[PDB]
């Protein structure tokens, strides 16, 4: 069934599961043509496939050559996402394959279900949550590797850096969603919060600054404040 706030701790049990977000797969700029009409120009995208228990991110980079000569790209993008997720699952040893794949957008269900017919024991589930994974492309190192790609490419990251050495998966996922929600709602302010102090460094093999436990408390409070301020602005409340 669908994933929501009632069954949210299920993400951190010992059944291997992956989130798949396809928001950033097909990305275009919209521009005017010489004749004054409108055209799209694609830029590189990515599939965001995340194990929320371990932090492992399988970032499949979608190079613009994928779209060359193809029609109905928004629809093709969902099928390309499903093809690549299935290819990932097939590449994993059986004991590493997920028991569930949770898609962030319901339109991914039929494409994935069809591509996963060979895996009847992998459940494909939607979610009622409004998860902020679209903001993955506001993480500088992720955006950089996507844009610099000259061909299709899979890049692996731990989206939690080393946090799991000190906190649980539940807490790490809450910290990630907070950071991503903030980046989604006001990227500039969110990045200012994270990036205001250049003497707080990011380790070459990390995505986020090396905050001490107490600095994380400060940062998390600042992100909460940002998100609530934006909320009142949106709804004049």
């Amino acid at each position: 069934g669908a994933m929501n706030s009632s069954n949210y701790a299920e993400l951190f049990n010992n059944d291997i599961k992956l989130f798949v977000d396809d928001t950033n797969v097909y990305r275009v700029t919209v521009h005017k043509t010489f004749e004054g009409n409108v055209a799209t120009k694609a830029i590189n995208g990515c599939i965001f496939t995340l194990n929320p228990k371990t932090g492992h991110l399988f970032l499949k980079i979608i190079h613009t050559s994928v779209w060359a000569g193809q029609k109905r790209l928004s629809q093709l993008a969902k099928w390309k996402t499903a093809e690549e997720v299935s290819a990932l699952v097939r590449s994993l040893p059986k004991e590493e394959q997920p028991k569930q794949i949770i898609v962030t957008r319901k339109a991914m269900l039929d494409p994935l279900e069809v591509h996963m017919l060979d895996f009847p024991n992998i459940a494909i589930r939607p979610t009622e949550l409004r998860l902020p994974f679209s903001a993955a492309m506001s993480i500088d190192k992720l955006s950089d590797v996507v844009m610099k790609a000259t061909e299709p490419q899979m890049v692996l990251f731990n989206i939690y850096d080393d946090w799991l050495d000190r906190i649980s998966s539940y807490t790490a996922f809450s910290r990630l969603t907070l950071l991503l929600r903030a980046l989604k709602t006001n990227e500039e302010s969110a990045k200012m919060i994270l990036l205001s102090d250049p003497t707080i460094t990011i380790k070459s093999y990390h995505l986020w600054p090396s905050f001490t436990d107490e600095q994380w408390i400060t940062i998390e409070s600042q992100m909460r404040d940002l998100i609530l301020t934006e909320y009142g602005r949106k709804y004049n409340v």
Partner: protein, 300 residues
Amino acid sequence: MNTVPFTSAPIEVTIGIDQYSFNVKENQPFHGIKDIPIGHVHVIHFQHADNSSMRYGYWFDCRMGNFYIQYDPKDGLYKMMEERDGAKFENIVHNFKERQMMVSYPKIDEDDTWYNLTEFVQMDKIRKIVRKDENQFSYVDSSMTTVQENELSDPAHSLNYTVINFKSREAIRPGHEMEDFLDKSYYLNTVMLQGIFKNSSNYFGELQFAFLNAMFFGNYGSSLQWHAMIELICSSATVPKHMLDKLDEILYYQIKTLPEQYSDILLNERVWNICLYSSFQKNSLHNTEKIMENKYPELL
């Protein structure tokens, strides 16, 4: 013109014969139906006055034997029986016609409705869907489940319709996932028509039989099958032109005959709007689209 004679009518019942129906009172002098047109299958069906639940009936072809109807007070239903003896049957029917104790199959000469609804339906294919080999006629009722329904419980009482499943390996070639899902022509033409049904007349015969079981018995699994077989054609970009014209005719007469007060449960809103307005064949069903728009614009 053949006869389905009744031994009696001990319980009050509404009797259907194809698209017609008559009320018979408890113990009324009722000895069956005459003048049944030869050359088509037929269905004789029953709704007891005291259980508006369970409609049931018998598919038959008078060319295949001498069928009568006798009430069974143990099982509580009107049963079809074949009279081996052509002359016990003949002298009996002879009597009953003489006493004018038979209703006449009330076909209007100008009226092709029953032919139009049963054009591709053959008894031998019915008997493969409804497996009961010791009889030449086939029993169906409101509650019988389909083989497909049973995969998702008594196998002997099942409707063995051909299983159609759009999210199945049968429907989807490896490496053509998107192609075969969004354009079902492979599934229609190669898997189903060439492979399982052999020809389009057999396909249309099962589609027509499924509709009639849905309409006459409220058989839900039959309605599912009728819609699935329509959707498979409409969701195929490549369909023989002869099948498209025939489908339009087939659906037109089904929609024409459907009881207006049943369209809410017999017609699937999603299938019909997809088929008429979104699918590859949205412009190939002109007669069906016109009768649907003038009769059931609410559903669309």
